[PDB]
Symmetry: D2
Subunit: 360 residues, 4 copies
Amino acid sequence: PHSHPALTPEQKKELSDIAHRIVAPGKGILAADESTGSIAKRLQSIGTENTEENRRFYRQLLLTADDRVNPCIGGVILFHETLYQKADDGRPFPQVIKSKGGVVGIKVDKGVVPLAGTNGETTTQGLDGLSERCAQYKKDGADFAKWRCVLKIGEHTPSALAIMENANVLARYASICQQNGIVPIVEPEILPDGDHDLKRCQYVTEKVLAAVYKALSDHHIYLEGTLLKPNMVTPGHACTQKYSHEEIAMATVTALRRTVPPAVTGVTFLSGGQSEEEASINLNAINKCPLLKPWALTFSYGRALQASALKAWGGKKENLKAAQEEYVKRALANSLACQGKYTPSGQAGAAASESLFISN
Amino acid sequence: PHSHPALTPEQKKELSDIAHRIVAPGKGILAADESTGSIAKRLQSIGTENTEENRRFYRQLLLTADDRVNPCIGGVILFHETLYQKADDGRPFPQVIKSKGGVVGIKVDKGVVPLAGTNGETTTQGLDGLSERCAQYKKDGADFAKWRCVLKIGEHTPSALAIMENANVLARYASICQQNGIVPIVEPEILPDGDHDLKRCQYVTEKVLAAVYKALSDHHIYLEGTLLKPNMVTPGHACTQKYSHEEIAMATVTALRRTVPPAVTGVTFLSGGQSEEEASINLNAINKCPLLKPWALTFSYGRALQASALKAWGGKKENLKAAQEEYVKRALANSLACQGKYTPSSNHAY
Amino acid sequence: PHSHPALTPEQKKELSDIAHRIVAPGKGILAADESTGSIAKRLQSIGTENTEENRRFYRQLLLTADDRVNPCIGGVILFHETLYQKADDGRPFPQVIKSKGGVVGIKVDKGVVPLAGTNGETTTQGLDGLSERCAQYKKDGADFAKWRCVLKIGEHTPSALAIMENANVLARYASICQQNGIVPIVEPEILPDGDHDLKRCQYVTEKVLAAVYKALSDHHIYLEGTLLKPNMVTPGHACTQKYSHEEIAMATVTALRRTVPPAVTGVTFLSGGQSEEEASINLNAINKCPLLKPWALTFSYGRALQASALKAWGGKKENLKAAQEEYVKRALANSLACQGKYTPSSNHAY
Amino acid sequence: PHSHPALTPEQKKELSDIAHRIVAPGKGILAADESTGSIAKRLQSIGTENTEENRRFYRQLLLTADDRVNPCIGGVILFHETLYQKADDGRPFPQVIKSKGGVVGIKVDKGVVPLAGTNGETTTQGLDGLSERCAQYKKDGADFAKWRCVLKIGEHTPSALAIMENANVLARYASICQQNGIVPIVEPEILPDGDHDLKRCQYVTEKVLAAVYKALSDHHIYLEGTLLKPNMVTPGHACTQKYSHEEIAMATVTALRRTVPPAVTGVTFLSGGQSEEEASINLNAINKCPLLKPWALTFSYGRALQASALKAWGGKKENLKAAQEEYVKRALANSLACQGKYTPSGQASNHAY
């Protein structure tokens, strides 16, 4: 019942300013924080061996795209390794990102671990020494961070324990981040895996977000200095019933309106397996949804911004420009999408029409 | 992890529609739901015996004020007794209210009870047979209800128990109301008693509201079909430090923005002891606050709408027109206030 | 983090003494608190009109059995109506019970109500004015009370909400009782309905009881001044897999040892549909289970003590002694059972 | 509402057997799990340089004490470093402990960290990579572990957050341990710092323990395969009012009876600053308390078993036997104390709570 300010007015301002810059109108996030074992899968789908150099080059390819992306990208999430890598001109990637008007973000979780006594459910680790790590990341150019929790819709999941534990650890992570001037992106991802319908996903998403914000309140989290990275509300990947983009948008926005306090600076949707075009079209429909939305509704896409780029690159240096062109096109599309001004056309290749879903 | 729809789309539309009508632009709530024991002091302060007749006459006086109040009053909260009384012309009060464009509300709690093991804290009773009562009230004209929980800021309060228990009973009440087509006004009032400052109130308000909404979620409450009646965020009555209306407005709006989901149709502030003018000036400041507010920010005033009217009446039928005039003036004042157009004569520091 | 004693040492002593008397060695509880609507089925099953007199007679029949039941009965739970009735000799039933060495109990809940948004789940009502009711019941002879919550094992039940809400209302009821010198019997009954196996019941029972005691703790309940009336851990009534009494006893004792603090004075099992013999055999096996049990493990039987007595009666006054004889037999059988002295004549797998 | 067994009957048996061996009648735990920084303080009090060799020599001093300690020590908690050190004869310390009938334990937390928004409260870290660490420790001789959470009694503490969070991390720690055949010792220490009285400590201890077991329930922890290491219930260090050992025992036992399920195999009290003799007398009183106690009530003492030994040693090899004698004496005293048979002689209304 007695307040013990976790943050000073000066600290709140820094976090709030940072969070707003990331989701400034028309801007979104490029999520290039794939771990070594994660990006390896991507490079593997293009006959490119996973080496530090190939990874460096690939990240450079995306980070050094032409100035057309500048207005589209408010922030870029990187993996530890990439944060300390340099472009061919000797500039550290964080400097490259900043020079283009982007805020630098660092993924800080250490992956999921199984929750004993549950039906294949997990929580996420990475709190140990997080404070020292954040202080260091801050000094090295990072202003925000990301932590991913993963939940799954099934007959007995997500369980009460899974929801509570994941919500609690997100709160702990967000608390430590804010103590070090880093804006925490809270990511409670509910996988699209399964044959559940739209209303099932909406129901679960509402329960999960309600739990997340109660935990954030219990841990004294400054909402204005945070961002939310949730799954859009969609039917399961194996669901038979078909839904329109307007319906997905309505379910997504309704779920958010029922759980996310207006103080939250912005919502940066994960693409979660959706095709590049599907992700853009849904985000656009979301921003057009005829309901009051007190927070920025933009993107924090990983796969939905890299599909075509990876394919065009093929691991060959000569395809540099071609790869960057595809990326730029998705960044431009999504920039318009988070403004509800996106209108599909007929290009972006067929690679943008293919589902990037990956069962877990 | 499985949904068992508490309400059908039709039930949802009904609740949502009722909620929106009560807090439509420029409209607020007249809280005239004082119980016999509660209206006792009011009448006592003016030397008027607490009889059913005087209560009926007083309530009639307010409910029949001239049409100038119509666009100001979106809803009227009544005490059980009043819901079944009639005006002189024989018209049931519920009918009077509705003919003036207002929705009829009914207070359904049965007062506070002490929570053992706490420092004078309480919870609220009234759930027994509530479903049947709501069905009967609905049939008899009421479309929304009110339930009051009381919390206090002290050295060890509100405690975890008080916050959790009051949030839970509010949720039960809300659930029962929605099952019977009644829009529940959730009122978690944090008393202004004490010498605590503005920051203290804001902090406690944020924690209480966060608890309230988690409980509403756990009980599957349809937020669009609800209204919130909280205290504005203000320093304690005995606080020596002084603040401006802009500051209490900033603290109030900031606290609501950090806890109240956008889906909540509206916030109807209680005046909780503030004077008529102060309550109007604060509501006005709240609506002009330079922050995004996704819900209607209006009033659900009891004392702040009756103070002058009660005094002018003095328990004398002769002063009917004089009394009503005072009420009308406050109704007009607050209608402008909830629009941020009243005149009586972001900050990271929150 | 701060304490505000809900009870004084004197109040604690009173409650603890009462709870211990009810479950003194070899003693159990006769649960005859069937409401008018509940006893109606019982009387109807034997073709007897459900009249106040017939209910009075049947209750008299049970309460005035010979002294052989005295050492068997530590307490008797009555329904409101019965607490105020008299035997043929003009003595009020509370006096009859007391003169036989029994403590008088009163059921105070007002039945279950549906929890909206759940798959047919419920919570229980009865808190309104409970304090005044308890104060009056205390004056009229009752020293303990009973409140029944009902949970069901199913595809999606008991849900998180159902567990939390029922646990919370039990805590509120317990709190109010103790403030009035009444020992509360906490009854969180998990129905045997379904085809679930023993393991599932043990799991649900462990989760439900952990919730109950956490709620009791949050509400500052004095455990030494309470009793627990849970379901024994058994397979569902329609489970195809079969088990032995020893397995039922092991599952039950294990569940309790993992959730019931040693401070709880006693566990008084409900029979929940089990036959008279079965209920006695399981209670005996529970008391013979080779695990440490820090609380009395006795009975609070309704049907398990009345089945044959009601049948031998049949609504005929000339079958009085015959019916009483059947009751005495089950009282004797269960008195031995709660001592592990009743004969019908790898614990890590739990 | 559906069970998804975290442990098989075989895994449960192993955990239960381990937990019971540790707190078998007359046995307690030697807590010698002081980290480098922690032991540095102990070594400084006797003007001894904090080098790995001195630490090894010190730990060796305690672990190789004569066979009189065998029936007194059911378990020994070691810091990571020590688990991998060897006695002069080349025997790994875990082997030394095992040969003397003791179960080997390993401290696995990585210290406390500040909880933002609280009045100086903390939670504890160390879950990262914990499963892998437990699998490795198990393989390397350890059968139980220890994780310490710290709470403080003050005007606004322990807060609801501190209680909830610390109870939650303990549950996570316990869950990971049991998945690896390691019996977790749950240690929710409520510091004795402050001027609060006996009833205040009992109140807080009761609320904390209630939170701890609800958390363990939510995380599906097998209680029979765990131990509890709580603070005894005593007045604050700065409390002006005095209390008898009988009252300390009554308050302690009452708090436990009201919160600790009988399924919990044993309670191993921390000495938390009490003198060697004080910790022994209180433990004896606790065991003599006239209330039903369904779990073993023994010790898990660090300072209360090493104070005199450390001083008698002074960092001089010459005083080895003298230092071991002091340790053995406390081991004997406490062995008698956890049986309520302790006496200064040697080795021969509860409603107000």
